[PDB]
Amino acid sequence: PPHGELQYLGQIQHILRCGVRKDDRTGTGTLSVFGMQARYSLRDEFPLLTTKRVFWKGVLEELLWFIKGSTNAKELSSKGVKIWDANGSRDFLDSLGFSTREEGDLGPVYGFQWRHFGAEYRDMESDYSGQGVDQLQRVIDTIKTNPDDRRIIMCAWNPRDLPLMALPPCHALCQFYVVNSELSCQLYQRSGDMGLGVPFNIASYALLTYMIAHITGLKPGDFIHTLGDAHIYLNHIEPLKIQLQREPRPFPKLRILRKVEKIDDFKAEDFQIEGYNPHPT
Amino acid sequence: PPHGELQYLGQIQHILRCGVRKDDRTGTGTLSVFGMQARYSLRDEFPLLTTKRVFWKGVLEELLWFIKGSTNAKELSSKGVKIWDANGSRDFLDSLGFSTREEGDLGPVYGFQWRHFGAEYRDMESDYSGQGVDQLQRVIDTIKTNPDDRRIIMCAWNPRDLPLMALPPCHALCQFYVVNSELSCQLYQRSGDMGLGVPFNIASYALLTYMIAHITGLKPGDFIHTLGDAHIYLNHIEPLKIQLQREPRPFPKLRILRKVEKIDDFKAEDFQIEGYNPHPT
């Protein structure tokens, strides 16, 4: 078997070679490619990239934050993870016109879309219990009842809610798939930062799969990563060039430390990564 | 230059070889693979598969039917396309607790979601003008004014309208991409009947790209076909393996006979398939 990270590095080679120049919303400033797909096996290994360190604590703590259904960036920052803070800033919110929202109010992002799709969004601290659609539970339930179902889909893209978010999700939807008691997951990521973003988004959905496969009593299969606008920022061309030279270490292993039955009962101390020795930045 | 149809036949060979037994809703009866991707060029050619004849009239009529905001299957059947009739059947409906619902009424399917996303569906006759997000136009608008946008997405998956609709979309969403005056499109297909529905599905979203590009004054680039549950029904295996022995004829071309300002002004008589030489069956 070849390494799973060799797909990610190969995707960088392609963008560096055949990628064309394209700007984002600020004028920057990228080398882009439209349409990619890589498959990462989760079978007795966890696709946490090794040619550079990945913020696993950020990965883990953000997902639980999503699963909680939280939409307040302060509730995440308390755990020492700051990747969402600047979007709930007391000035950036007014930049989008959201002057009425208090500090932290991202609007109807992932956690709200996952647990309460369709619901009318009030504030961060409003209780949306039983309101909307808990498609995360619908996923877990459907897997338990009809594993053959070709509809196990959790969509975070709500066209009604787009003008109310800090920014539209880079992960439109994910779809789950069960065969031979193996749970597999495909993620559709509309936009991907191969340098900074992408490695984080592989761990995040490999983790979710590991969570659901644990609950539904299945064993993790493949994680399919599908990209739309796969781009490399020009100020990363050289650091990525040197990283391509590095050789992938053996993937670590994600292990759950207690039998968890419900999904909202998962805590950051239930997961342990062992054997993770990445390259130095 | 490698022929684009080889990807389709290639996918089939993989599923026949590395595919596993997986059933569907009705106990049948397939060979499944989760996660596929193929790229079909739209540059000076149209990916109408030629190893077997594709029902282009149906491909063309169904899409105009979509743009029409239609959910009545008989509006399409009246055009010589009988592919949604059994789904809008007076019996198929009763087999889904839609005994209160009239025949042809497929529910909040594609045509509704594209033109009126987020609107309270009632029936196939009420007009939902000024209701629901017009995703189809918002796409065209954003392409005209902001081609760098990494958010041009037409999502047809609405977990709220999932009860009310007959068949939940096999085509969850499609994303558009513009660089160097080239419009590209990627479809995320929830499930794919390889030897039956897939060639039809490919031609559908290529045409849509050809339409939108024509409207937006652009030259079509690539159509990326991402698949989730890609499957082959057991009774298609031998007909498909004979089809595997065929060498693909050069793809036809799609000429637009006139000049259309708005997407709604499109008519069947504006298109002309040229150079289509498919194998028989």
Residue numbers in the entry:
A (entry chain A), B (entry chain C): 26 to 306
Sentences from the paper on this structure:
The only de novo biosynthetic pathway to generate dTTP (2′-deoxythymidine-5′-triphosphate) requires reductive methylation of dUMP (2′-deoxyuridine-5′-monophosphate) to dTMP (2′-deoxythymidine-5′-monophosphate) by TS. The TS enzyme is an obligatory homodimer whose subunits associate with nanomolar affinity to form a dimer that adopts an asymmetric conformation upon substrate binding. Inhibition of TS leads to the cessation of DNA replication and thymineless death of proliferating cells, which renders the enzyme an attractive target for cancer chemotherapy. Ligand-free TS protein binds its own mRNA and thereby represses translation.
To gain direct insight into the molecular recognition of mRNA by hTS, we attempted co-crystallization of the enzyme with oligonucleotide constructs representing the TS site 1 motif. X-ray data sets were collected and structures determined for crystals grown at low salt (100 mM buffer) as well as high salt (1.75 M ammonium sulphate) concentration. Molecular replacement with previously published hTS coordinates furnished structures with the enzyme adopting either of the previously observed active and inactive conformations of the loop regions about I108-G129 and A181-A197; however, each without RNA bound. In the active conformation, the catalytic C195 is located in the active site, while it resides at the dimer interface in the inactive conformation. Crystallization of hTS at low salt may have led to discrimination against RNA ligand binding by crystal contacts that involve the putative RNA-binding region. Although the crystallography effort furnished structures of the protein in both the active and inactive conformation, co-crystallization of an hTS–RNA complex remained elusive.
